[PDB]
Amino acid sequence: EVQLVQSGAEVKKPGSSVKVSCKASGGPFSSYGFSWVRQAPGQGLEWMGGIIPVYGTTNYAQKFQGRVTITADESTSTAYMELSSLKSEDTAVYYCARDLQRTPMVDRIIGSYYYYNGLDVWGQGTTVTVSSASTKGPSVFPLAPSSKSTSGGTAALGCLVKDYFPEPVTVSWNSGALTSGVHTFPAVLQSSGLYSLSSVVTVPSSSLGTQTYICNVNHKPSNTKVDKKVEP
Amino acid sequence: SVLTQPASVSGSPGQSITISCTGASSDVGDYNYVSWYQQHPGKAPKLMIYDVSNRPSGVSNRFSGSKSGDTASLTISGLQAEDEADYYCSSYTRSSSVVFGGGTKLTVLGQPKAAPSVTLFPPSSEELQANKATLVCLISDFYPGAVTVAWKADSSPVKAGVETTTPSKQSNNKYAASSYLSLTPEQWKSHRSYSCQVTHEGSTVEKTVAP
Ligand SMILES: *[C@@H]1O[C@H](CO)[C@@H](O[C@@H]2O[C@H](CO)[C@@H](O[C@@H]3O[C@H](CO)[C@@H](O)[C@H](O)[C@@H]3O)[C@H](O)[C@H]2NC(C)=O)[C@H](O)[C@H]1NC(C)=O
Secondary structure (H helix, E strand, C coil): CCEEEECCCEEECCCCCEEEEEEEECCCHHHCCEEEEEECCCCCEEEEEEEECCCCEEEECCCCCCCEEEEEECCCCEEEEEECCCCHHHCEEEEEEECCCCCCCCCCCCCCCCCCCCCCEEECCEEEEECCCCCECCEEEEECCCCCCCCCCEEEEEEEEEEEECCCCEEEECCCCCCCCEEECCCEECCCCCEEEEEEEEEEHHHCCCCCEEEEEEEHHHCEEEEEEECC | CCCCCCCEEEECCCCCEEEEECCCCCCCCCCCEEEEEEECCCCCCEEEEECCCECCCCCCCCEEEEEECCEEEEEECCCCHHHCCEEEEEEECCCCCCCCCCCEEEEECCCCCECCEEEEECCCHHHHHCCCEEEEEEEEEEECCCCEEEEEECCEEECCCEEECCCEECCCCCEEEEEEEEECHHHHHHCCCEEEEEEECCEEEEEEECC
16 A cells, blocks of 8 residues: 655744655555645644646645645655745644545646545644744752652652743653653643643552652753652 | 534444535536545544545445535444544535535543542742742543633632643543643742632532642
């Protein structure tokens, strides 16, 4: 079968542009229509444009006319989508998807010609985050456990990862040793444009004051690595 | 041209269900390039129906499509738990060259309820030394993923500085969410206590911290 391989994730400031590649790692490429569909988080699918490489023709949705450009490379079997004048509303997952049937033979080719039977082969998607915030390392604060070592049952402790950008961050406990009861929550996007999340472990109360608990926060975009010891 | 789709449909296992695209059928002598897609979270859409009554190889015969007038319909027979996903319809017109519908979230009912396990943390001493304060309220293991959070300080509701995430499915088919309350160190120790109330399906669980 056919596989569509897309480029990695992208982060852009507003007003800039982004170009996503779509490598058709299979047979079809030449006589097949390729479409570019984006999907905002928690929203519906939106088609931006399509291209037929053999005919050198493109068709763009009226919403993206003027700032979208879809090109093809017949040699390497690769498709491209370039979106300029990026706005924060363009933050979405961008997919490239081939059509299901070979294009029909068109003797009189319209420059905007395109066909659509159905997109059966899709790529893995490319996340494009359009913000205006700058890269910032997070401040890591402990979340001290409420209960004591004699209160019985289980206790909860964690770490607060505040005011960082961009995603993602990774939080381990005891250098990857403590993996049970760990619940790292999805980050929140504040009005300032920075993210904030928390990760917590549900530990036996009798282990408080006996087992050392350390959270390992790693934010690669800012080269920030913080080891914070959480104590009662 | 816009294709309208029900925002949500719900059925039980064994039940049959019909979603309905109610957009493009236009342009009388032109043909109907109508198609349907299924999309699970974090994965690419999957072509289930095209060409409106046709179905590609490998797709279960429980899915079928039809169209009457300006309304197309996707019928799913013998609902299974794996069918719970998002569904979209599409259509090619001369005017607009494809239009993906708004989408329909299909829910497979019958699953048991689950009250949320809530943990609330006071601000650290290390954070207060930096002249900042943040309350961490963590919501875990509730079913389904619909919940709302209200913060209070000594029975008085507070709106300023509340940042709440959207629910997300865990690895155990239950959902999780977190809420953050930002405060100055004066507002934290001047008040008597702070509470995070998590109301889920009318049942409210509460936790309280104090300096
Ligand atoms: C005949 O015409 C076609 C256009 O229909 C020419 O194709 C073009 O081929 C060049 C390479 O020969 C492609 O350039 C490449 O661009 C990528 C970046 O996308 C770059 O990394 C490569 O190093 C290379 O420069 C070009 O994209 C491609 N254009 C299209 C529209 O497919 C072909 O070269 C022509 N051949 C002759 C003999 O005239």
